[PDB]
Description:
The chain is mostly helical. The chain has a domain of 59 residues: Orthogonal Bundle (Arc Repressor Mutant, subunit A). Helix content is 41%, strand content 0%. Helix 1 crosses helix 3. The N and C termini lie far apart (54 Å). It is classed as rna binding protein. The entry lists the keywords SURP domain, nppsfa, National Project on Protein Structural and Functional Analyses, rsgi. The assembly is monomeric.
Amino acid sequence: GSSGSSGTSALAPVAAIIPPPPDVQPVIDKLAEYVARNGLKFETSVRAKNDQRFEFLQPWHQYNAYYEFKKQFFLQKEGGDSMQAVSAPE
């Protein structure tokens, strides 16, 4: 093999989160809690698979928006630093 073909996506029209079906809801959450515990490094593996079951993870996909919400949930739920940003008014 080679591993490493077309590893870049373009800018697509995506905004706001959409409430997925009950068949995919539990399919996206299960992964969220998994990546929140294991680590973001896992997301890189699942993406490499690009399986029909793991399509919502894709950038173009709309469900991806929801996944981002879950990832943060389980994340902050078990941590989530603050990291203060340097002030710089006008």
